[PDB]
Amino acid sequence: GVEIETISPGDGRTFPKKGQTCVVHYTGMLQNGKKFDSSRDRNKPFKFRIGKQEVIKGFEEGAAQMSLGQRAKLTCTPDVAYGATGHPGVIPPNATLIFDVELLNLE
Amino acid sequence: ALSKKVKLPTIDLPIESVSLSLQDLIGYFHPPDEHLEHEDKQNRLRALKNRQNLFQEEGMINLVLECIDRLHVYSSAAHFADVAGREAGESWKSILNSLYELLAALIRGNRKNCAQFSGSLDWLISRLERLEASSGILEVLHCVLVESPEALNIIKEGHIKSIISLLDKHGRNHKVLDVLCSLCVCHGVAVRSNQHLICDNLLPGRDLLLQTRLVNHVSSMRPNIFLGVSEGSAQYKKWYYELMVDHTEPFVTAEATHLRVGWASTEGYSPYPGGGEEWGGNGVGDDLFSYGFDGLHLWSGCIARTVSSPNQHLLRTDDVISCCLDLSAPSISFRINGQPVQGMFENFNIDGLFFPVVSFSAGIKVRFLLGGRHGEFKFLPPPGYAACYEAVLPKEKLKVEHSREYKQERTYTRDLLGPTVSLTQAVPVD
Amino acid sequence: LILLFSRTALTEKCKLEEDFLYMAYADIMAKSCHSFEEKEMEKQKLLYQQARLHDRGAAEMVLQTISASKGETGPMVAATLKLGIAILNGGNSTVQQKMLDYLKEKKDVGFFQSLAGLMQSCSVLDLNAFERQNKAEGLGMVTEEGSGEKVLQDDEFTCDLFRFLQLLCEGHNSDFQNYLR
Amino acid sequence: LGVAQVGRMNFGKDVSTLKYFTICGLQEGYEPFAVNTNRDITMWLSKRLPQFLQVPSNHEHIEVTRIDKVTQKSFGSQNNNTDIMFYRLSMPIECAXXXXXXXXXXXXXXXXXXXXXXXXXXXXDSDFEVLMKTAHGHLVPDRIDKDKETPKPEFNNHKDYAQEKPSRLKQXXXXXXXXXXXXX
Amino acid sequence: SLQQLISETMVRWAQESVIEDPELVRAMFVLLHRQYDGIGGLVRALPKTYTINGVSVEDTINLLASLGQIRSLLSVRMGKEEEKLMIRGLGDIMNNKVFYQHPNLMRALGMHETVMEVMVNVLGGGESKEITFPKMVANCCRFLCYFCRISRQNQKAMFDHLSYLLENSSVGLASPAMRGSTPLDVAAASVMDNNELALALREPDLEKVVRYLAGCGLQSCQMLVSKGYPDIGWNPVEGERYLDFLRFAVFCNGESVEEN
Amino acid sequence: PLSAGLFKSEHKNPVPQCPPRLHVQFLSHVLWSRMPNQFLKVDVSRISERQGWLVQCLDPLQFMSLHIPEENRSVDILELTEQEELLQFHYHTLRLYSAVCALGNHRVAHALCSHVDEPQLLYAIENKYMPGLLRAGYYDLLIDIHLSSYATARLMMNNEFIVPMTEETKSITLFPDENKKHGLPGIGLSTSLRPRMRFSSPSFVSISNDCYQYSPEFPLDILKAKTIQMLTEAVKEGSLHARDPVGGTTEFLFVPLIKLFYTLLIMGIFHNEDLKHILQLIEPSGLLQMKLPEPVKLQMCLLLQYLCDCQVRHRIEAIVAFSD
């Protein structure tokens, strides 16, 4: 259910694949444009290893279809991101997620 | 006797007597002023505490509670007037306010009183939505929540929802927030249940409270070109110019660097186009009098619509773009690296003096491309489309201001200006 | 500082707090105070030391602190009584007159009833506790109890309190002798 | 400053550029306005775009009253000069992704322009009314089958308009020529 | 020179201006008294200092983290997650190795007082109408029991609080759910096997326990009648607990204490 | 079903009521705008070269803005000075943000970090034209979200001195007092058992966070350097007694800054060189001799209290070292 805009190309040669970690750098945003998260405020890239379900399904699957040096806009669905309950306090129930993810490195 | 059923009005309703007694009791339970001697202030405090305890012993708090029980069954002064007389109807609101003030004053300082009738908070919070006694109920609730931690122990999810709904229905009231603070913390000790309830029930949606964000400063750059099309003198209704960039940064500090370009209209036949105030996060395309493009979306009225184009990209370095403007039948057209984009802004108002404009945030080196005296063309214009260096009027200089005003980093030596004219020029004698 | 202590003692409460600051500074205030010329000079300098702090409100502060305890034997009264002893050493007629005038102008019972409550629970030797401690010592070498072997509780406090009541009447102050009755 | 008038303001901070302060002011004890400051003054100005504001009670030629069956918020005015006024409601209606249509029904049936285009917008209810000697045109939240606001007018209803508008800051007496654009 | 400078400034400010906000003047005079007395800080802090070794540093760091969590949960109102975290911290303090080798460190850190007035918060609110958080009460009681058990001086430390907990010892009785953890049982553990403490046990409270035993022997248990028992005219459970406590108070080390 | 039943909390109510928020707004011209005191620094090439018309903008510039949602409008932070209602409401909003995470509540703090921002806290504490109430509120929020929990925890073990028997512990037995010197407070070796600091990274894309039981992460080096900078020019400004202290009056300038400095000092940062610089910021015989208001001297009393407590701890450590 997640869909992708390419914004800057990532030369489509290296992809995140099972058994690897990915270094992303993202500024999450709600459906109405109100930013809810960002990896640039804390000035540290987000490192996450693929395939062990440590991030949400939307981010997981969107990063699984990306390339090194690429900018992408991931549009997700409530069922694939947080369900009908959302994140308590931050994400309202039944909300779509928009992520501005840039891929830096690929171990 | 009047409320139970329809009875002959030979009843005693001492409206003025009870109003005067309520005022006298409110004065009787007046806290001492802060501009007093310490000894006298302590004496007044002890006397007030004794009076409050003595009134508590007679259970008169319950008595005023039942008085407002019997008095809240109506809806408005008009509703009360035709049932209990004009004077009672017009004094009903004042009597309610006086009763609530007396109830608050009876309990302002006591911990014992608050602990004693904490059992009645399910009642006050339920009737908080009276809309003619909301201020008094909120004051009583705050003054009973601040003192006794026992009151906080019976605050439930429904009461939190009721208070948040009261805030969302009555607007930005700064006392509701104080009540929420008192609910979160009472005496140096926190309630994790209430904290979590407020956190996950008040601001997941961001409709409230007042939101916040950090954005980048954006400004525009436009040349001394004005394009007014009407009957009579016309300027071929065809214009075209290119644009290139030397250096760019996708994210300079924290957010994507603004970089848009297009054509902006004006107000009537005068400069200073409508739109953003000035010095905002909005450039070209963030209003109905400017139409811009940033590589991925078409901006018009601060609403972006993505457009298809071979090799989607943002305006990276060494990018050459072309802008066409036709006025009457077609509209403003953009081309990315030669071939035209697949979207354009038809059927827009032609009133105003159009001009090219580019808006940028920071970390950018922009180069307008006109022909002849101002530069070269990287691509061939479509047939008929002229350029700005020809659009300039004969025998006038052509420079580039920002967009509207003196947006220059200068000291007090700035030429601050008032209103202007419509250029005094924007048919032979019969 | 005296005004701070007086206001703290005057604020209405239900019990006198520990107030480590007051306990520490009453110590210093009490210890500040204390062949014919060498005996007259020391008496005059003692009068000067008492004047250094009794005209700034300590005479009323001690009375307020005593009144604010409502007859509860503790370190607060134990320190304020030592301060009273230091401020009333000798026949300080000026301090006695100041205390009597303050008590008469502010007709408070909370001082005299507090004194009565304090004296109702000062100390009495108890043969039960004494012989019980004797048995404990015989059974094993138990460390001696600090507070006078727990048989005489706050004997120093009782002596200080009665010394205060005596110094209040020292000389032949008939007015305050009749006031005490 | 009036039309085509440009000037310069000096609150101090440069005694080397305060020209005639030494001539007058330095001797009889006059100081510059902001002499003991570490930063420049904010220099507020009269903004030109007329954003909306709540109706102030202490405002003449304009009176709004609230009553209440059905609820409504009625109008009144006592003035000798007339103009066009741009009343707007407090907060707008939000349209989601799917829903996108607006129908204007008169005293009869639906008969107006085809204003049905909104991917994700916030339409703020509004009416633009001409000031008459007696103007009681007001808004009533009614119910037939869905959300329904009735801007009930009175006599001389030919140049008053009633619609829903987004953020729009333009003060002028016009009928059409409203800002618009169709993206292809 | 810091003492000199602080004594300079503190008296300088009061000389310059009459000072409102009694908190500020209190702080200034506390600072001045600290500067002049000097050794007061040493004599107040050395009783609370401790040394253990150069090898078991991380173990006592785990101890300190657990105690800090306990105190933080003390500073928060009583709850389900609160009681779960408090129980986990108490169990960590149990399983800690340093809890045995350095019993003096426990008293220096004041764990007994912390658990005492963690449990007082639970025991408050009511007297005979609600005994909520029984698991929290039991964890506190067993912690105090074991802490006073593994010592010769923690018994003396808990003897001071023995007077208070006998007042509300009626809770946790008439139920075979904690044969161990109880305020009465921790009173017994504090007075257990020490003739010095048995003698120092004066008799403000023995006749209190006698009143409780008389009430138990006269009244049946409302709890048991609600359970569904045939309502015999007396209660044999709380009375048995009181008799056990009195037996432990009277008989010590095989010789009956004569006065008790 | 209704107009009012669509843009509010409830929707299943078909009764058309009008809560007070629904008030008619008329397009008026009574409004004031504010000039930013800093501009974008736009430089044109001015050469009109043969390859085009060049404009340049390199220096970054950012500002923060409230978003009134029911009016769907963005307004700069500095414009709140004139608007009294919005000013007070946002101050109370910041107070509520502090209250909902006052004590050691970390889930709410993790929520609130994103509910505002990470870096706008730095921007607000560094900005000069702040309304004062919001300056204090943002300072308190920055303290509460990140620093308050560990500052409190480290203050909890302040009066307990557990000292190990390591060789590095057996090195401060000299406690330099001889050859005409006394040392400096907080300077030297501690080797005393103190609670450690560790902050969890705030991430809302990571499903099933383990416990997030400690705190949200915050960059401490930038914060401490900025605190040094602001204290330096704050004392510089207060030396001359200007008529526009930051945040309005001088207490709004000093109390939040001194509070942030004090809690940073408590947390266990400002290594010996930084402590030396802070010492010479006050001591040279500065800040004690200034005409300070009551809350400012109240906070500086706490500063001196900690400066005495660290001396007491050093004395205890030296005593144990010699006793070994």
Mutate to test the interface with D, among B416, B420, B423 (most CBs of D within 10 A): B416
Q: Which of C7, C25, C139 sits opposite E22 (nearest CB)?
A: C7
For residue A49, the surrounding DSSP H or E stretch is: strand A46-49
Residue E75 contacts residue F103 (beta carbons within 8 Å): yes
CA distance C168 to chain E (A): 30
Q: How far apart are the first and last CA of chain E?
A: 59
**Cβ separation of A28 and F118 shorter than 8 Å?**
no
Hey, which residues does B340 pair with through a beta bridge? Answer: B335
Nearest Cα to Cα of residue B212 among A36, D44, D168: A36
Residue with tokens 């604010």: C68
| Spatial separation of the C-alpha atoms in residues F206 and F63, rounded to whole Å | 30
Using CB atoms, list chains with 3+ pairs below 8 Å to chain A: B, F
Q: Quick one: how many helices (H) and strands (E) in chain F?
A: 9, 7
Q: Within the 32-71 window of chain B, which residues sit less than 8 Å (CB to CB) from chain C? A: 38-39, 42, 45-46, 49
Output the CA torsion sign for E18, E20, E26, E31: negative
**Residue F52 CA: distances (Å) to CA of B241, B366, D56:** 11, 9, 54
For residue B43, the surrounding DSSP H or E stretch is: helix B38-57
| Spatial separation of the C-alpha atoms in residues D167 and F75, rounded to whole Å | 14
CA distance E238 to chain C (A): 30
> Does residue B77 belong to the interface with chain D, where contact is any CB pair within 8 Å?
no
DSSP string, E73-109: HHTB---HHHHHHHHHHHHHHHH-SHHHH-HHHHHHH
Number of neighbouring beta carbons within 10 Å of residue A5: 15
**What's the number of CA atoms in the CB half-sphere (13 Å) around residue D122?**
14
| Crossing angle between the packed helical segments C155-169 and C112-119, to the nearest 10 degrees | 140
| Spatial separation of the C-alpha atoms in residues B181 and F319, rounded to whole Å | 47
| Spatial separation of the C-alpha atoms in residues E160 and E164, rounded to whole Å | 8
**Cβ separation of E20 and F294 shorter than 8 Å?**
yes
Q: Which of B149, B152, B192 sits opposite E79 (nearest CB)?
A: B192
b/e per residue A39-52 (b: at least 16 CB within 10 A): bbbbeebbebebee
Residue D38, classified by CB atoms within 10 Å of its CB into exposed (0-12), middle (13-18) or buried (19+), is middle
| Crossing angle between the packed helical segments F220-240 and F272-282, to the nearest 10 degrees | 10
| Spatial separation of the C-alpha atoms in residues F259 and F138, rounded to whole Å | 12
Q: Report the relative pairing of strands B320-326 and B304-306 from DSSP bridges.
A: unpaired
> Does residue E1 belong to the interface with chain B, where contact is any CB pair within 8 Å?
no
Nearest Cα to Cα of residue F46 among F38, F56, F36: F56
> F-chain residues within 8 Å CB-CB of A43?
219
**Residue B218 CA: distances (Å) to CA of E83, F42, F122:** 54, 10, 21
Nearest Cα to Cα of residue F76 among D121, B419, D47, B299: D47
Q: Within the 187-206 window of chain B, which residues sit less than 8 Å (CB to CB) from chain F? A: 189-190, 192, 195-196, 198-200, 203, 206
**Strand, helix or coil for residue B222:** strand
> Does residue D11 belong to the interface with chain B, where contact is any CB pair within 8 Å?
yes
**Strand, helix or coil for residue B11:** coil
Number of neighbouring beta carbons within 10 Å of residue D78: 10
Residue type, E214: A
Q: Report the relative pairing of strands B364-369 and B238-248 from DSSP bridges.
A: antiparallel
> B-chain residues within 8 Å CB-CB of D178?
349
Residue type, B236: Y
For residue C102, the surrounding DSSP H or E stretch is: helix C93-105
- Cis (ω within 30 of 0) for the bond into B209? yes
CA distance F61 to chain D (A): 17
| Spatial separation of the C-alpha atoms in residues D102 and D104, rounded to whole Å | 7
| Spatial separation of the C-alpha atoms in residues E68 and E75, rounded to whole Å | 11
**Residue C75 CA: distances (Å) to CA of A34, B165, C22, E19, E42:** 61, 54, 10, 28, 21
Structure tokens at E126: 């009511």
> Does residue F219 belong to the interface with chain A, where contact is any CB pair within 8 Å?
yes
Residue F122 contacts residue F223 (beta carbons within 8 Å): yes
CA distance F12 to chain D (A): 12
What positions of A carry a catalytic annotation? 26, 36-37, 56, 82, 99
Helices within chain E (DSSP H only) = 2-16, 22-37, 39-45, 58-74, 80-95, 98-101, 103-109, 111-123, 134-149, 154-167, 183-191, 195-200, 206-218, 222-227, 238-250
CA distance E20 to chain F (A): 8
**Residue F36 CA: distances (Å) to CA of A15, B405, F63:** 46, 13, 10
| Spatial separation of the C-alpha atoms in residues C37 and D39, rounded to whole Å | 70
| Spatial separation of the C-alpha atoms in residues F118 and F135, rounded to whole Å | 16
> D-chain residues within 8 Å CB-CB of B298?
183
Residue of B nearest to A11 (CA): B311
Nearest Cα to Cα of residue B332 among B263, B242, B244: B263
Going across the sheet that includes D63-67, the strands are D63-67, D72-76, D138-143, D147-152
Residue with tokens 């005038």: C101
* Sequence-separated (6 or more) residues with CB below 8 Å from residue B89: B77, B78, B79, B80, B81, B82, B83
Number of neighbouring beta carbons within 10 Å of residue D148: 15
Q: Within the 80-99 window of chain A, which residues sit less than 8 Å (CB to CB) from chain B? A: 86-92
Enter the DSSP assignment of F62: E
| Spatial separation of the C-alpha atoms in residues F316 and B394, rounded to whole Å | 89
Number of neighbouring beta carbons within 10 Å of residue C181: 5
Nearest Cα to Cα of residue F24 among D112, B68, D87: D87
Hey, which residues does E76 pair with through a beta bridge? Answer: B190
Number of neighbouring beta carbons within 10 Å of residue B274: 20
> B-chain residues within 8 Å CB-CB of E86?
none
Q: Report the relative pairing of strands F161-163 and E49-51 from DSSP bridges.
A: parallel
Please count the residues of chain C: 181
Output the CA torsion sign for B297, B298, B299, B303: negative
DSSP string, F171-229: G-TT-S-TTT----TT-S-----------B---SSSSS-S---S-B---HHHHHHHHHH
Nearest Cα to Cα of residue D62 among D140, D154, D149, D129: D129
Enter the DSSP assignment of F144: I
Residue F144 contacts residue F150 (beta carbons within 8 Å): no
| Spatial separation of the C-alpha atoms in residues D126 and B151, rounded to whole Å | 45
CA distance F128 to chain D (A): 9
Residue of F nearest to B255 (CA): F62
Residue type, D61: H
* Sequence-separated (6 or more) residues with CB below 8 Å from residue E209: E166, E242, E245, E246
Residue E236 contacts residue E243 (beta carbons within 8 Å): no
Residue C10 contacts residue C64 (beta carbons within 8 Å): yes
Query: Distance of alpha carbon F291 from its chain centroid, rounded?
Result: 24
| Spatial separation of the C-alpha atoms in residues D46 and C15, rounded to whole Å | 62
Residue of B nearest to F50 (CA): B375
Residue of E nearest to F161 (CA): E49
**Residue B277 CA: distances (Å) to CA of A65, B304, F74, F106, F291:** 42, 20, 10, 40, 43
> Does residue F222 belong to the interface with chain E, where contact is any CB pair within 8 Å?
no
> F-chain residues within 8 Å CB-CB of A57?
207
Helix, strand, coil percent content, chain B, rounded in steps of 5: 35, 20, 45
Number of neighbouring beta carbons within 10 Å of residue A56: 23
**What's the number of CA atoms in the CB half-sphere (13 Å) around residue B156?**
7
**What's the number of CA atoms in the CB half-sphere (13 Å) around residue F185?**
22
Residue B351, classified by CB atoms within 10 Å of its CB into exposed (0-12), middle (13-18) or buried (19+), is middle
> B-chain residues within 8 Å CB-CB of D43?
416
Structure tokens at F298: 């109240």
| Spatial separation of the C-alpha atoms in residues D162 and C141, rounded to whole Å | 101
Q: Within the 28-57 window of chain D, which residues sit less than 8 Å (CB to CB) from chain B? A: 40, 43, 47-49
Nearest Cα to Cα of residue B378 among B423, B337, B317: B337
Nearest Cα to Cα of residue F104 among B153, E81, B155, E114: E81
CA distance B351 to chain D (A): 8
| Spatial separation of the C-alpha atoms in residues D41 and A47, rounded to whole Å | 46
Residue with tokens 């502090």: F98
| Spatial separation of the C-alpha atoms in residues B365 and B221, rounded to whole Å | 12
**Residue E189 CA: distances (Å) to CA of D33, E95, E208:** 79, 20, 18
| Spatial separation of the C-alpha atoms in residues E254 and E247, rounded to whole Å | 12
| Spatial separation of the C-alpha atoms in residues F171 and F184, rounded to whole Å | 17
* Sequence-separated (6 or more) residues with CB below 8 Å from residue C126: C151
Number of neighbouring beta carbons within 10 Å of residue B202: 22
| Spatial separation of the C-alpha atoms in residues C65 and D21, rounded to whole Å | 64
Hey, which residues does D14 pair with through a beta bridge? Answer: none
> A-chain residues within 8 Å CB-CB of B206?
30, 32, 34
**What's the number of CA atoms in the CB half-sphere (13 Å) around residue B353?**
18
* Resolution, expressed in angstroms to one decimal: 3.3
Using CB atoms, list chains with 3+ pairs below 8 Å to chain D: B, F
| Spatial separation of the C-alpha atoms in residues B322 and B241, rounded to whole Å | 6
Enter the DSSP assignment of A45: P
Q: Backbone phi, then psi, for B300, in 5-degree steps?
A: -160, 115
For residue D75, the surrounding DSSP H or E stretch is: strand D72-76
> D-chain residues within 8 Å CB-CB of B301?
166, 179, 181
Q: How far apart are the first and last CA of chain F?
A: 83
| Spatial separation of the C-alpha atoms in residues F71 and F54, rounded to whole Å | 39
Nearest Cα to Cα of residue E141 among E87, E96, E101: E87
Structure tokens at A75: 């549009």
Q: Given its phi and psi angles, is residue B386 left (phi above 0), alpha (psi -120 to 50 degrees) or beta? A: beta
Q: What is the dihedral of CA F187, F189, F193, F196, to 10 degrees?
A: 70
Enter the DSSP assignment of B120: G
| Spatial separation of the C-alpha atoms in residues F134 and F125, rounded to whole Å | 10
| Crossing angle between the packed helical segments B86-106 and B38-57, to the nearest 10 degrees | 110
